Design a protein around this ligand. Sequence first.
Ligand code: SF4
Ligand code: SF4
Ligand code: SF4
Ligand code: SF4
Ligand code: FES
Ligand SMILES: [Mg+2]
Ligand SMILES: [Mg+2]
Length: 580
Amino acid sequence: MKTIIINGVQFNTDEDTTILKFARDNNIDISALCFLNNCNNDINKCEICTVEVEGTGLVTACDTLIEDGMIINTNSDAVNEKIKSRISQLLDIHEFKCGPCNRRENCEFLKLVIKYKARASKPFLPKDKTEYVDERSKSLTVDRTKCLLCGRCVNACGKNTETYAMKFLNKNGKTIIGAEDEKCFDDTNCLLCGQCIIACPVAALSEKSHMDRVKNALNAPEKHVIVAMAPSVRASIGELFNMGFGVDVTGKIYTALRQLGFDKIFDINFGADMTIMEEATELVQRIENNGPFPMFTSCCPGWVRQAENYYPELLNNLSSAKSPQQIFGTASKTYYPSISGLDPKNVFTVTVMPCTSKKFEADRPQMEKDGLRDIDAVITTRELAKMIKDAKIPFAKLEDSEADPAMGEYSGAGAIFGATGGVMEAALRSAKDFAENAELEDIEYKQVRGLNGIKEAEVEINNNKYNVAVINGASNLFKFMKSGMINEKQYHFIEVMACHGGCVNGGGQPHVNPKDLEKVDIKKVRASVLYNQDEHLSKRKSHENTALVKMYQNYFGKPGEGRAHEILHFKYKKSAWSHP
Ligand code: SF4
Ligand code: SF4
Ligand code: SF4
Ligand code: SF4
Ligand code: FES
Ligand SMILES: [Mg+2]
Ligand SMILES: [Mg+2]
């Protein structure tokens, strides 16, 4: 039993919780900065959450437990002067130039600087930013002129992936964040999943920009620029246009893309149906051959890097079907010329992804054929929003349009790919039809859905029982492997997503400030858009996609053999033995 006084208001409570959490639950404003994911920066507390506790003095609300008898003041002059001072000291290490900054519209530090009217003691104005910037990665970029040393990226990497690939380092006698030994992230165990970017309150961590690749292609007279968006983009991008959360903006995106000058509007959900054709065909082959097992998905490039970096002995069990991004891109340089008359060399294929790891996937050396890359550029959901705003397109006011259908139609199975368990559910819908040679009516697999970290299910296919698992976040992959769960039974098909929640929570998604994250379950709300589409779509199985059926009939032949196997697949292998 506890009685506490906050700003003169008495509260009676039995809760055991921090001052910050209690205050937020009771509509009392306390500021915070380094607190995120239930953790603050223990070795360098920001102290933005400072409050006064009578008899004790100034304390950090984000990590101090309420106790019976506490009398708390959150808004005294002494408290506010301390907070202002901490913000001023951060400005002393921050290049405060918001005009061209990519977080200008949604920066948590700027909000605090305005709120406390803080100013640097000395403006931080480095003349040469070269030593502060790291753009070596295909996926991530670091600008340490903006870094507050808040630790949010370090903590988020450990929580989300358990790789600890993001670290505090000593560089030239100064503390920075970066990769192991200050190497390029891509050359370390890093997954390039971008959860560190999602955790950053400022513009210090960003995606590696592909915006100039795209602009130059749009402006080249002879290039025919295809664009296709991932499942999750249509459930997410509206957030950056003050539209709120959970808004389906599929048709507005198609219109915006035409206004930006793209030459063909397709959809990666078509590629998702392609991946299902190959992946369900492979699963059925393995079922009819009673092996090999388990089969892992290979469509999340964060998981592919996790397997390469930590479980190379599993690479032979990964599916060889290309991911929807790469399988679509392969078809865009082969099938698409065959139905359009375009010279393949002049097609430039752009995807819009909720993902930074997809930029590494698209840039893998062997993701090409006959000199033509499968995918020429990958922009994130955030990059597309900036492109729209730079062009002055009034996004929230646009009318709906449709995709071009030849590589644009999608079934409901493809639409759900962006949520954890979506690939599994989509694959089972086709595998059961294929193996049983039937058109089954019961197609919903709710047991694989939702935010649990490890989700197992038993499925009956062709009068035998099989075991499936959906691994939801890279940290949960480690738990599943390290605890021996992989050996507790025979698994037959396993989905792995590196980002908890699936691609709707990817590393290229709009930032959400900590207060909105408490108010809204972003992973569930974004996913609900995708499940709503599947419910209302006429075709809810990938192999019922009419444009896809035409494409295989006229160009690829049978899935899993012949031309389809030759060009639509990509096999991972552990490295050849060498010493040292
Ligand atoms: S990170 Fe925030 S405060 Fe710093 S320059 Fe960019 S918008 Fe301004
Ligand atoms: S990209 Fe993912 S694995 Fe790499 S440092 Fe960031 S959070 Fe960690
Ligand atoms: S990169 Fe961003 S999240 Fe990481 S310590 Fe710097 S400001 Fe904080
Ligand atoms: S879960 Fe999706 S967004 Fe996250 S790394 Fe994998 S493909 Fe990228
Ligand atoms: S928010 Fe409490 S110490 Fe940083
Ligand atoms: Mg702490
Ligand atoms: Mg053009």
